Amino acid sequence: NDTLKVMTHNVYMLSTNLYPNWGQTERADLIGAADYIKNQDVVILNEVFDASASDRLLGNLKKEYPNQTAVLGRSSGSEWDKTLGNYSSSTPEDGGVAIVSKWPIAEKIQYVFAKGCGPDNLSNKGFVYTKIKKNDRFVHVIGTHLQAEDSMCGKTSPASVRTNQLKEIQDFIKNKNIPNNEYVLIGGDMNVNKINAENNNDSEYASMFKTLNASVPSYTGHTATWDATTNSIAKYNFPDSPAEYLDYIIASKDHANPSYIENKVLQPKSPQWTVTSWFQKYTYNDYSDHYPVEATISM
Ligand SMILES: [Mg+2]
Protein backbone atom coordinates (compact mmCIF):
# COMPACT_ATOMS: atom_id res chain seq x y z
CA ASN A 1 0.00 0.00 0.00
CA ASP A 2 3.04 2.33 0.33
CA THR A 3 1.90 3.01 3.96
CA LEU A 4 4.14 2.63 7.06
CA LYS A 5 2.44 2.66 10.51
CA VAL A 6 4.95 3.42 13.28
CA MET A 7 3.92 3.89 16.90
CA THR A 8 5.81 5.27 19.87
CA HIS A 9 4.79 4.93 23.47
CA ASN A 10 6.54 5.91 26.70
CA VAL A 11 5.12 3.13 28.94
CA TYR A 12 6.30 4.23 32.45
CA MET A 13 7.79 0.94 33.50
CA LEU A 14 10.02 2.10 36.29
CA SER A 15 12.21 -0.44 38.10
CA THR A 16 10.18 -2.24 40.84
CA ASN A 17 13.11 -1.98 43.27
CA LEU A 18 12.81 1.82 43.34
CA TYR A 19 9.16 2.33 42.47
CA PRO A 20 7.33 -0.86 43.66
CA ASN A 21 3.69 0.36 43.60
CA TRP A 22 3.07 1.28 39.98
CA GLY A 23 1.28 -1.76 38.59
CA GLN A 24 4.20 -2.66 36.32
CA THR A 25 3.47 -6.44 36.08
CA GLU A 26 -0.25 -5.78 35.57
CA ARG A 27 0.25 -2.97 33.04
CA ALA A 28 2.54 -5.29 30.97
CA ASP A 29 -0.49 -7.63 30.54
CA LEU A 30 -2.94 -4.79 29.91
CA ILE A 31 -0.68 -3.14 27.28
CA GLY A 32 0.02 -6.55 25.56
CA ALA A 33 -3.71 -7.20 25.20
CA ALA A 34 -4.63 -3.60 24.32
CA ASP A 35 -6.26 -2.52 21.02
CA TYR A 36 -4.34 0.67 20.41
CA ILE A 37 -0.96 -1.06 20.00
CA LYS A 38 -2.27 -3.53 17.37
CA ASN A 39 -2.08 -3.07 13.59
CA GLN A 40 1.29 -1.26 13.47
CA ASP A 41 4.40 -2.09 11.46
CA VAL A 42 6.84 -0.93 14.10
CA VAL A 43 6.44 0.08 17.76
CA ILE A 44 9.05 2.11 19.65
CA LEU A 45 8.97 1.73 23.45
CA ASN A 46 10.46 4.07 26.02
CA GLU A 47 10.84 3.53 29.72
CA VAL A 48 10.87 -0.27 29.70
CA PHE A 49 13.27 -0.09 32.68
CA ASP A 50 12.02 -2.91 34.88
CA ALA A 51 13.69 -6.25 34.08
CA SER A 52 10.67 -8.52 34.72
CA ALA A 53 7.89 -6.24 33.61
CA SER A 54 9.73 -5.41 30.40
CA ASP A 55 10.49 -9.10 29.56
CA ARG A 56 6.84 -9.84 30.19
CA LEU A 57 5.61 -6.96 28.01
CA LEU A 58 8.05 -7.83 25.17
CA GLY A 59 6.88 -11.47 25.57
CA ASN A 60 3.17 -10.47 25.23
CA LEU A 61 4.02 -8.41 22.10
CA LYS A 62 5.80 -11.48 20.48
CA LYS A 63 2.53 -12.66 18.89
CA GLU A 64 1.94 -9.59 16.75
CA TYR A 65 5.54 -8.22 16.78
CA PRO A 66 7.91 -11.21 16.79
CA ASN A 67 10.92 -9.31 15.49
CA GLN A 68 12.39 -7.51 18.49
CA THR A 69 15.49 -5.78 19.79
CA ALA A 70 16.91 -6.10 23.28
CA VAL A 71 16.38 -3.15 25.65
CA LEU A 72 18.94 -0.36 25.15
CA GLY A 73 21.87 -0.47 27.57
CA ARG A 74 21.01 -3.69 29.36
CA SER A 75 23.82 -5.71 27.69
CA SER A 76 26.56 -5.54 25.02
CA GLY A 77 26.42 -9.13 23.69
CA SER A 78 25.56 -10.58 20.30
CA GLU A 79 21.88 -9.59 20.63
CA TRP A 80 23.34 -6.32 19.14
CA ASP A 81 25.26 -6.25 15.84
CA LYS A 82 27.12 -3.28 17.31
CA THR A 83 27.28 -1.24 20.53
CA LEU A 84 28.54 2.35 20.11
CA GLY A 85 29.15 5.39 22.28
CA ASN A 86 29.64 5.73 25.98
CA TYR A 87 28.31 2.35 27.04
CA SER A 88 29.09 1.33 30.64
CA SER A 89 28.37 -1.94 32.51
CA SER A 90 28.43 -0.31 35.95
CA THR A 91 25.82 2.49 35.66
CA PRO A 92 22.80 1.11 37.64
CA GLU A 93 19.97 1.46 35.07
CA ASP A 94 19.48 0.66 31.35
CA GLY A 95 18.23 3.07 28.68
CA GLY A 96 14.62 1.86 28.58
CA VAL A 97 14.27 1.85 24.77
CA ALA A 98 13.24 -1.24 22.71
CA ILE A 99 11.87 -1.60 19.12
CA VAL A 100 9.51 -4.34 18.00
CA SER A 101 8.38 -5.06 14.44
CA LYS A 102 6.19 -7.30 12.37
CA TRP A 103 8.86 -7.22 9.64
CA PRO A 104 12.34 -8.77 9.81
CA ILE A 105 15.10 -6.69 11.35
CA ALA A 106 18.21 -6.80 9.14
CA GLU A 107 20.45 -4.80 11.58
CA LYS A 108 20.28 -3.80 15.29
CA ILE A 109 22.64 -1.13 16.67
CA GLN A 110 22.65 0.47 20.13
CA TYR A 111 24.28 3.81 20.81
CA VAL A 112 24.71 5.29 24.34
CA PHE A 113 24.79 9.10 24.58
CA ALA A 114 27.98 10.87 25.78
CA LYS A 115 26.42 13.57 28.00
CA GLY A 116 23.73 13.36 30.72
CA CYS A 117 22.42 15.45 33.62
CA GLY A 118 20.86 14.86 37.07
CA PRO A 119 19.32 11.37 37.61
CA ASP A 120 19.45 10.64 33.81
CA ASN A 121 23.30 10.59 34.25
CA LEU A 122 22.87 7.22 36.04
CA SER A 123 21.06 5.69 33.05
CA ASN A 124 22.59 4.48 29.72
CA LYS A 125 20.26 6.65 27.62
CA GLY A 126 20.68 6.57 23.84
CA PHE A 127 19.02 5.26 20.77
CA VAL A 128 18.27 1.99 19.11
CA TYR A 129 18.86 1.89 15.34
CA THR A 130 17.04 -0.69 13.28
CA LYS A 131 17.02 -1.38 9.56
CA ILE A 132 13.73 -3.03 8.71
CA LYS A 133 12.88 -5.05 5.60
CA LYS A 134 9.30 -4.45 4.56
CA ASN A 135 8.55 -6.11 1.17
CA ASP A 136 11.86 -5.53 -0.70
CA ARG A 137 12.01 -1.97 0.74
CA PHE A 138 14.42 -1.11 3.62
CA VAL A 139 13.23 1.44 6.16
CA HIS A 140 15.39 2.78 8.98
CA VAL A 141 13.92 3.53 12.43
CA ILE A 142 15.83 5.23 15.28
CA GLY A 143 14.02 4.99 18.65
CA THR A 144 15.15 7.25 21.42
CA HIS A 145 14.34 9.06 24.70
CA LEU A 146 16.26 12.26 25.44
CA GLN A 147 17.44 14.00 28.63
CA ALA A 148 14.49 15.06 30.79
CA GLU A 149 13.88 18.56 32.27
CA ASP A 150 15.42 17.98 35.67
CA SER A 151 16.03 20.43 38.56
CA MET A 152 19.14 18.55 39.71
CA CYS A 153 21.00 19.19 36.40
CA GLY A 154 22.92 22.19 37.79
CA LYS A 155 24.77 24.68 35.57
CA THR A 156 24.23 22.17 32.70
CA SER A 157 20.90 23.16 31.23
CA PRO A 158 18.85 20.19 30.07
CA ALA A 159 18.15 21.87 26.69
CA SER A 160 21.85 22.02 26.02
CA VAL A 161 22.24 18.28 26.77
CA ARG A 162 19.35 17.47 24.41
CA THR A 163 20.94 19.55 21.63
CA ASN A 164 24.07 17.45 22.12
CA GLN A 165 22.21 14.12 22.03
CA LEU A 166 20.35 15.18 18.84
CA LYS A 167 23.74 15.99 17.18
CA GLU A 168 24.85 12.52 18.16
CA ILE A 169 21.85 11.03 16.38
CA GLN A 170 22.39 13.18 13.29
CA ASP A 171 26.15 12.34 13.11
CA PHE A 172 25.34 8.67 13.35
CA ILE A 173 22.84 9.05 10.47
CA LYS A 174 25.27 11.11 8.34
CA ASN A 175 28.15 8.66 8.81
CA LYS A 176 25.86 5.63 8.29
CA ASN A 177 25.72 6.49 4.60
CA ILE A 178 22.08 5.51 4.01
CA PRO A 179 20.81 5.87 0.43
CA ASN A 180 18.66 8.94 -0.06
CA ASN A 181 15.87 6.80 -1.54
CA GLU A 182 15.20 5.01 1.75
CA TYR A 183 13.14 6.34 4.66
CA VAL A 184 14.90 7.33 7.87
CA LEU A 185 12.55 7.83 10.84
CA ILE A 186 13.41 9.08 14.27
CA GLY A 187 10.92 8.44 17.07
CA GLY A 188 10.47 8.69 20.83
CA ASP A 189 10.03 10.95 23.83
CA MET A 190 12.26 13.87 22.84
CA ASN A 191 11.47 15.91 25.94
CA VAL A 192 11.03 18.94 23.75
CA ASN A 193 7.76 20.73 24.21
CA LYS A 194 5.75 21.75 21.16
CA ILE A 195 3.11 23.68 23.19
CA ASN A 196 3.42 27.52 22.96
CA ALA A 197 6.58 27.01 20.84
CA GLU A 198 5.23 26.15 17.36
CA ASN A 199 5.34 29.85 16.42
CA ASN A 200 8.83 30.86 17.64
CA ASN A 201 11.70 30.17 15.19
CA ASP A 202 14.24 30.17 17.98
CA SER A 203 12.39 27.77 20.34
CA GLU A 204 13.92 24.47 21.38
CA TYR A 205 11.09 22.89 19.30
CA ALA A 206 12.16 24.74 16.08
CA SER A 207 15.80 23.86 16.73
CA MET A 208 15.13 20.12 17.04
CA PHE A 209 14.15 19.94 13.39
CA LYS A 210 17.13 22.04 12.32
CA THR A 211 19.52 19.91 14.34
CA LEU A 212 18.14 16.60 12.97
CA ASN A 213 17.55 17.90 9.41
CA ALA A 214 14.02 16.64 9.85
CA SER A 215 10.63 17.74 8.52
CA VAL A 216 7.65 18.85 10.61
CA PRO A 217 4.80 16.27 10.61
CA SER A 218 1.10 17.01 10.48
CA TYR A 219 -0.64 16.75 13.81
CA THR A 220 -3.93 15.14 14.54
CA GLY A 221 -5.68 13.66 17.61
CA HIS A 222 -5.21 14.92 21.16
CA THR A 223 -3.35 18.16 21.87
CA ALA A 224 -0.90 16.76 24.45
CA THR A 225 1.16 13.61 24.99
CA TRP A 226 1.76 14.22 28.69
CA ASP A 227 -1.38 15.61 30.27
CA ALA A 228 -2.20 15.91 34.05
CA THR A 229 -5.71 17.21 33.18
CA THR A 230 -6.92 14.00 31.35
CA ASN A 231 -4.48 11.30 32.48
CA SER A 232 -4.83 9.61 35.85
CA ILE A 233 -1.14 8.86 36.50
CA ALA A 234 0.10 12.30 35.47
CA LYS A 235 -2.61 13.87 37.67
CA TYR A 236 -1.46 11.81 40.61
CA ASN A 237 2.22 12.82 40.25
CA PHE A 238 1.86 16.42 38.97
CA PRO A 239 -1.72 17.60 39.53
CA ASP A 240 -1.03 21.28 38.61
CA SER A 241 1.49 20.93 35.76
CA PRO A 242 0.44 22.37 32.41
CA ALA A 243 -0.01 19.70 29.64
CA GLU A 244 3.05 18.93 27.52
CA TYR A 245 3.62 17.77 23.96
CA LEU A 246 6.85 15.71 24.00
CA ASP A 247 6.60 12.56 21.83
CA TYR A 248 7.37 12.50 18.12
CA ILE A 249 7.90 10.42 14.97
CA ILE A 250 9.66 12.44 12.29
CA ALA A 251 11.43 11.84 8.95
CA SER A 252 14.99 12.81 7.95
CA LYS A 253 14.87 15.44 5.12
CA ASP A 254 18.19 14.13 3.66
CA HIS A 255 16.65 10.77 2.69
CA ALA A 256 13.38 9.61 1.17
CA ASN A 257 10.64 12.22 1.33
CA PRO A 258 7.15 10.97 2.21
CA SER A 259 4.13 12.20 0.27
CA TYR A 260 2.85 12.80 3.81
CA ILE A 261 3.64 12.00 7.46
CA GLU A 262 1.01 12.30 10.17
CA ASN A 263 1.45 12.10 14.01
CA LYS A 264 -1.87 11.23 15.71
CA VAL A 265 -1.95 11.34 19.52
CA LEU A 266 -4.33 8.70 20.84
CA GLN A 267 -6.02 8.65 24.25
CA PRO A 268 -6.84 5.09 25.01
CA LYS A 269 -8.01 4.22 28.55
CA SER A 270 -7.22 0.92 30.18
CA PRO A 271 -9.28 -1.38 32.37
CA GLN A 272 -9.22 -0.17 36.04
CA TRP A 273 -6.19 -1.39 37.97
CA THR A 274 -5.50 -0.48 41.63
CA VAL A 275 -2.48 -0.07 43.87
CA THR A 276 -1.91 0.52 47.57
CA SER A 277 0.47 3.46 48.22
CA TRP A 278 1.29 5.03 51.65
CA PHE A 279 -1.61 3.11 53.25
CA GLN A 280 -4.26 4.54 50.89
CA LYS A 281 -5.98 2.80 47.89
CA TYR A 282 -5.72 4.19 44.32
CA THR A 283 -7.30 3.23 41.05
CA TYR A 284 -6.15 4.15 37.58
CA ASN A 285 -7.56 3.86 34.08
CA ASP A 286 -4.35 4.71 32.09
CA TYR A 287 -1.62 2.48 30.54
CA SER A 288 1.05 5.04 31.32
CA ASP A 289 1.46 8.80 32.05
CA HIS A 290 2.20 9.47 28.34
CA TYR A 291 -0.26 8.94 25.52
CA PRO A 292 0.88 6.98 22.43
CA VAL A 293 1.66 8.64 19.09
CA GLU A 294 0.56 6.74 15.97
CA ALA A 295 2.46 7.88 12.85
CA THR A 296 1.27 7.14 9.27
CA ILE A 297 3.90 7.56 6.59
CA SER A 298 2.75 7.69 2.95
CA MET A 299 5.53 6.26 0.82
MG1 LIG B 1 8.50 9.42 32.71
Curated annotation (Swiss-Prot):
> One GO BP annotation here?
killing of cells of another organism
Q: Per its UniProt record, what Pfam families does this chain match? A: Exo_endo_phos (PF03372)
* A single MF term (Gene Ontology): sphingomyelin phosphodiesterase activity
Q: Where are the transmembrane segments?
A: none
Q: Which reaction does it catalyse?
A: a sphingomyelin + H2O = phosphocholine + an N-acylsphing-4-enine + H(+)
Report the family membership: Belongs to the neutral sphingomyelinase family.
Q: Which species is this record about?
A: Bacillus cereus
What Gene3D superfamilies does this protein's entry cite? Endonuclease/exonuclease/phosphatase
Which named protein is this? Answer: Sphingomyelinase C
Name its cellular compartments.
Answer: Secreted
**Which InterPro entries does the entry link to?**
Endo/exonu/phosph_ase_sf, Endo/exonuclease/phosphatase, Sph/SMPD2-like, Sphingomyelinase/PLipase_C
Recorded E.C. number(s)?
3.1.4.12
Write down the required cofactor(s).
Mg(2+)
The protein's superkingdom reads Bacteria
